[PDB]
Each structure stands twice: as structure tokens, then as C-alpha cells.
Amino acid sequence: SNQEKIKKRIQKLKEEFATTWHKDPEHPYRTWTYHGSYEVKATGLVNGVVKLMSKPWDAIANVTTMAMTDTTPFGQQRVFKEKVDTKAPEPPAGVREVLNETTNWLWAHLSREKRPRLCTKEEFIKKVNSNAALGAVFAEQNQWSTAREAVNDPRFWEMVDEERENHLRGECHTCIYNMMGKREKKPGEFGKAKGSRAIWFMWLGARYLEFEALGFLNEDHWLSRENSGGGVEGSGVQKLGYILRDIAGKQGGKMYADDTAGWDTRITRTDLENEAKVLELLDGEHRMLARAIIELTYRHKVVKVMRPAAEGKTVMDVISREDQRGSGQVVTYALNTFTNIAVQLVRLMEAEGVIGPQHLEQLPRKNKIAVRTWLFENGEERVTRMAISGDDCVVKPLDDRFATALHFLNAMSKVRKDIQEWKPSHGWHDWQQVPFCSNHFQEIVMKDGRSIVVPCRGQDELIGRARISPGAGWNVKDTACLAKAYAQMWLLLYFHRRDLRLMANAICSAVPVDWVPTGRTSWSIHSKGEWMTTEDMLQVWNRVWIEENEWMMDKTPIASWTDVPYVGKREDIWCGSLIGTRSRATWAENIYAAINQVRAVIGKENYVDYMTS
Numbered sequence: 338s339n340q341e342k343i344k345k346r347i348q349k350l351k352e353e354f355a356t357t358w359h360k361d362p363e364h365p366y367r368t369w370t371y372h373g374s375y376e377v378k379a380t381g382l383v384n385g386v387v388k389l390m391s392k393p394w395d396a397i398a399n400v401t402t403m404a405m406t407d408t409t410p411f412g413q414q415r416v417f418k419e420k421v422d423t424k425a426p427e428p429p430a431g432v433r434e435v436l437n438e439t440t441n442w443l444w445a446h447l448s449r450e451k452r453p454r455l456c457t458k459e460e461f462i463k464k465v466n467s468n469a470a471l472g473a474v475f476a477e478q479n480q481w482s483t484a485r486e487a488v489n490d491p492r493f494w495e496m497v498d499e500e501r502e503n504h505l506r507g508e509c510h511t512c513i514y515n516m517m518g519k520r521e522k523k524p525g526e527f528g529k530a531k532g533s534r535a536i537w538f539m540w541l542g543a544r545y546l547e548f549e550a551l552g553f554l555n556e557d558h559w560l561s562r563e564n565s566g567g568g569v570e571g572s573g574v575q576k577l578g579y580i581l582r583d584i585a586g587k588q589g590g591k592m593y594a595d596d597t598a599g600w601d602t603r604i605t606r607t608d609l610e611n612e613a614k615v616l617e618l619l620d621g622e623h624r625m626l627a628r629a630i631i632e633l634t635y636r637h638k639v640v641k642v643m644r645p646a647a648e649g650k651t652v653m654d655v656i657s658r659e660d661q662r663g664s665g666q667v668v669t670y671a672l673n674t675f676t677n678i679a680v681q682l683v684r685l686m687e688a689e690g691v692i693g694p695q696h697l698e699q700l701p702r703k704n705k706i707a708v709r710t711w712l713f714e715n716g717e718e719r720v721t722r723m724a725i726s727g728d729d730c731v732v733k734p735l736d737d738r739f740a741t742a743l744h745f746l747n748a749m750s751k752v753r754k755d756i757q758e759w760k761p762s763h764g765w766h767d768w769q770q771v772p773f774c775s776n777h778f779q780e781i782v783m784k785d786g787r788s789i790v791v792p793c794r795g796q797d798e799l800i801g802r803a804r805i806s807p808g809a810g811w812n813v814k815d816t817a818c819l820a821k822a823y824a825q826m827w828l829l830l831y832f833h834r835r836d837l838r839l840m841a842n843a844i845c846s847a848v849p850v851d852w853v854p855t856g857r858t859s860w861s862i863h864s865k866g867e868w869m870t871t872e873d874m875l876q877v878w879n880r881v882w883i884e885e886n887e888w889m890m891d892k893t894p895i896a897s898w899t900d901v902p903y904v905g906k907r908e909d910i911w912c913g914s915l916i917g918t919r920s921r922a923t924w925a926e927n928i929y930a931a932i933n934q935v936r937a938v939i940g941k942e943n944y945v946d947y948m949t950s
């Protein structure tokens with residue numbers, strides 16, 4: 338039966354590469370069914386402007402050694418073995434009953450006003466022709482080369498329609514995962530650093546089909562705060578401090594922000610079944626299509642991944658498994674947020690004495706009743722005590738028993754990161770120490786007496802990333818525009834950091850004022866890209882921090898960067914500032930040599946001197 342569901346995809350591959358197809362070099366796979374291999378060509382960059390603008394950071398290992406990804410077969414195999422070739426154990430019956438109730442409640446709540454609907458060809462095309470199918474990583478669109486000309490060709494859509502017909506017939510032929518490579522470990526403090534993660538691609542057609550059947554979850558903002566209560570989908574990172582500060586404003590215990598150790602390796606068949614309840618929000622064709630996506634591409638997966646073989650040779654392995662997720666899906670962020678809300682509701686019920694460790698193997702009827710009653714009476718309020726974005730969460734429980742409420746959490750395989758399994762969680766009395774979506778947030782006072790809540794994170798990581806250039810095919814122009822994008826992003830979000838204000842300004846002084854920022858500064862669903870512009874950044878700043886800031890009452894425009902605040906020196910240094918050092922002072926004093934050196938490489942252009950201060 339599982340055999341049956343993957344047969345067609347395997348047969349397609351076995352036939353396309355019948356030439357080199359063989360059955361295995363002692364294959365490494367332990368939890369994945371191995372089908373065979375074939376021969377392939379193995380797969381596997383500094384920003385000059387930012388580099389030149391950041392001389393002191395040449396002495397800092399976090400910056401100089403930074404790498405994003407490893408798409409070699411070696412890196413594919415490493416990440417596959419560490420992160421994908423594992424199986425989370427199913428939770429026991431009581432826990433299942435608690436998650437069953439909890440997810441029934443959450444689905445009823447998310448669907449209270451929003452109605453599910455198909456997304457469309459034209460919606461997808463519009464999505465593709467922009468700031469992207471951002472992160473649902475895109476691409477086999479192999480013969481067009483880019484996604485834009487692929488969606489522009491009627492032949493692409495005929496392929497889509499054919500596979501759509503197969504789905505409607507209960508079969509899947511082409512919808513196959515490719516593990517393109519490894520996203521390296523990201524920096525963080527203990528309990529917050531992200532481990533390496535797999536990078537998944539599928540054919541563009543597969544992405545369309547997924548998007549059509551389930552993309553409404555994203556496109557109609559099912560996980561927005563307004564709809565989900567605990568979610569924050571749609572909000573810029575500049576809203577998130579304010580949201581934490583409102584949560585902090587409620588009466589309760591400390592604030593907790595436990596990460597799961599590798600969330601995407603820890604979702605169980607149970608979590609999938611509860612997610613799959615989405616099917617009953619659906620009717621007719623819509624449901625048929627979504628059912629095919631869930632049953633055939635989410636559950637019965639087929640996966641291609643590279644492996645090093647004999648003579649500096651590379652094979653592609655073909656493997657399958659009755660599985661769950663990994664990301665690489667169009668709705669991975671939405672469903673992670675759903676399941677993680679449910680997870681936090683369960684933990685809150687344990688923390689509030691509704692359920693205990695006696696209940697894991699079996700949930701007594703009396704407790705089932707109390708569970709349902711607690712969700713009915715408290716769900717809507719408890720959800721507002723949370724900020725959940727994917728696997729990132731912050732929660733403010735009623736009281737600090739939450740610290741020890743770990744039985745259901747561990748039984749659900751949602752083991753917390755970098756803390757011993759049964760050690761109570763650490764919570765914070767101060768909302769400004771709480772980490773969330775790679776930031777913490779600081780309330781700072783401006784000269785005019787008004788205050789703002791600004792995002793803050795390790796400066797080395799920011800500088801390190803800006804120094805990276807994805808382009809083999811980036812112009813002098815594209816490099817300077819990307820440097821510009823980073824600089825302007827720092828001006829909108831991290832202006833309060835002295836080195837970043839200074840570095841951003843020097844970069845904007847060095848790059849032609851009429852050049853439009855291009856490229857990508859962040860993968861986060863929370864970076865909205867207000868800095869991708871040639872508009873004067875202070876006006877953008879005013880619009881974001883004053884005008885459209887619903888926590889800003891007095892709408893009085895700020896007129897000069899002079900009146901835009903910095904964090905206290907203590908903070909700045911804490912999060913990696915180089916102020917106070919001889920290196921950074923030499924740097925501030927000689928910056929102009931670097932600027933003019935850039936202006937001299939780029940050539941005769943309209944420039945502006947932004948080092949007024």
C-alpha cells in the first residue's frame with residue numbers, strides 16, 4: 338500500500354536514469370527505504386563594499402569564518418544522517434487524546450471567520466514575480482532556468498494540469514523531494530542557537546499544486562495574531578518587541594521561551610494527523626486536491642539526495658518513507674505554528690493541573706472533560722499569552738509551575754534544547770531579556786521623551802551576513818546594491834547600534850544614491866523589506882517607527898537622525914559593539930579612505946555624503 342503510493346514516482350526515476358541505475362554501494366540509510374542510485378554531476382563569495390567598510394571585523398572569527406550552506410554531496414550526507422535519517426517516537430494514548438481535543442479546539446478557533454479557498458495560477462505567478470515564493474525553496478524549473486519564464490510558458494501549465502489530473506485520480510507521479518544541501522548552524526545563546534537544517538527543493542509544479550490546495554493558510558493569513566491569537570504571521574520584526582511587551586503587561590509568572598531541539602525532526606505522525614484535520618474545513622474538488630497533497634506528498638514521500646562514491650564520483654540516491662514535513666513545504670511555517678500553539682496549550686494545561694504524568698498512557702474521562710472545558714473557557718485568553726512563529730515561541734503562563742510542566746512536553750518528543758531533559762525551564766522577569774525570532778527587544782527613550790521598542794541581536798552575525806555575496810553573477814552594480822540593502826535594513830531596524838549606524842551610512846555614502854537596493858538580506862518571514870528603496874531612509878523610519886507604529890500615540894515626525902536614539906553603550910557592547918577599542922576608533926577616523934576607494938572603483942556617479950555626524 339505505501340509501495341503502491343510511491344511506485345509511480347520511483348518508476349519515473351528508474352526509467353529516466355535507467356542508464357546508470359544500480360542498487361547500492363552499502364547505502365547508509367537507516368530509517369528510510371532505499372530504492373537505488375544513479376550517476377550525477379556533483380554540486381557545491383565576498384561583498385567588496387561591505388568588506389571595505391568593515392576593516393575591524395577582519396579580526397573577528399564569527400565574521401570571517403561565516404558560511405551559510407554546504408551543497409556538496411558530503412554536506413548533503415552529513416545533514417541527512419544527523420537530521421533527516423531519524424524517527425521521532427509516537428506519543429502514548431493519553432497524550433494523543435489531549436492533542437486530539439486541543440487541535441480540535443485550535444482548528445475550530447482558526448476557522449471561525451476565515452473560510453478556506455483555492456489559490457490560483459495568477460496568484461502563484463504574482464507570487465513568483467516578486468520578493469519570492471520566499472523560502473519554499475523553489476527550483477527544479479529545469480529547462481526554463483528561472484521561475485518567471487517557466488510560469489510564462491503554457492507548456493509548464495500543461496504539465497501542472499496533467500499532475501493535477503493524477504492527483505484528482507488519487508495518484509502522484511512527479512511530486513518528489515530533493516535535499517539540495519545543508520544550512521549551517523546559526524549563532525545563538527544556549528537554548529536558542531539553531532542547529533544545521535536540510536534544504537529541500539521540489540519541481541515548481543509541485544509547489545504550485547501545494548500552493549493551490551493549502552496555500553490559503555498563508556495567503557489569507559490564518560496564523561496572523563488577529564486570527565490565531567498567539568501567532569504573529571504578517572508582522573514585521575519591528576512589531577515583535579511591542580507584542581512581547583504587551584504579553585509582559587498581563588498578570589502571570591515569568592516569561593518562557595524554550596526552543597525545541599530541532600523541531601522539524603520532532604514532529605510525529607500524531608502531529609501530522611492533527612494538522613490533516615484541515616481536510617474537514619474543505620469541500621468537493623478543493624478537498625480532493627488537498628487530500629492528494631497531504632496523503633501523497635506529505636505522508637508518502639520520495640526523496641533524492643547526493644552521496645560521494647568511488648572515484649571522486651557522485652551518485653544520487655532514491656529513497657522513500659511514510660514520513661512528516663522537514664520544511665521544504667509551502668505550508669511548513671503555518672503548520673509548525675499551528676502545532677506549536679497546540680503544544681503550548683498542552684503544556685499550559687499541565688502547568689495548571691488539568692493533566693499530570695498519570696495521564697500520559699491513559700486519559701481518564703474526567704480529565705477529557707476538564708481538558709475540553711479548559712479549552713472552551715480559557716483557550717482564547719491563553720493564546721494571547723503567547724507569541725508563536727514556527728518553532729519559535731514565547732509564553733507567559735499564569736504561574737511558574739510552567740517551569741516544571743514537562744511530562745506531556747517530553748512525551749510529545751518536543752524535547753527542549755541545551756537543557757537537561759527534566760531540569761525546570763528558566764523564565765525571565767524582564768521581557769527585554771526574552772529571545773524570539775533571533776532578536777531580543779529593548780525599550781529606549783528618545784530625546785523628545787517618547788520611547789520605542791527596538792530589535793536587537795549579535796552584531797557579528799549581522800556584519801558577517803552582509804559581507805556575504807550570493808552572486809557568482811553579481812555586477813559591481815549588484816554587489817553595491819546588495820551592500821545598500823543591508824545598510825538600509827540596519828538603518829530601519831538596528832539604527833540604535835553605533836557601529837551599524839556608522840557602517841550603514843558609510844556604505845550609503847559609497848554607493849550611487851540613485852541605485853536601488855537588490856537581493857535578500859534575510860530569509861525571515863518577519864523581514865518585510867521596507868529598506869529595499871531609494872526613498873530617503875529617515876522618511877521610511879518615520880513611517881515605520883512613528884506613523885504606522887500603533888504603539889506610538891504622538892504622531893510627531895522626527896526630523897533628524899540626530900534625534901533617532903542609540904541603545905545604552907552597555908547594551909551595545911553586550912551585543913558585540915566595538916566601541917571603546919583602538920581598532921573601531923581608527924576605523925571611524927579613516928572611513929573616508931574606504932568610501933572614496935569605493936566611489937573610485939564604481940566611477941563617476943551621483944553620490945551623497947551621509948557622514949554629516
Ligand SMILES: Nc1ncnc2c1ncn2[C@@H]1O[C@H](COP(=O)(O)OP(=O)(O)OP(=O)(O)O)[C@@H](O)[C@H]1O
Nearest residue numbers: 670673726727728729774775858859860861862863
Ligand atoms: N519555523 C521557522 N522556520 C524557519 N524560520 C523561522 C521559523 N520561525 C521563525 N523563523 C524566522 O527565521 C529566522 C532564523 O532562521 P532562518 O533560517 O530563517 O535564518 P534567517 O531568518 O535568514 O536569519 P535571519 O533572521 O538574520 O534572517 C528567525 O529569526 C525567524 O525570524
Ligand SMILES: [Zn+2]
Nearest residue numbers: 509510511512
Ligand atoms: Zn504529485
Ligand SMILES: [Zn+2]
Nearest residue numbers: 793794908912
Ligand atoms: Zn542586544
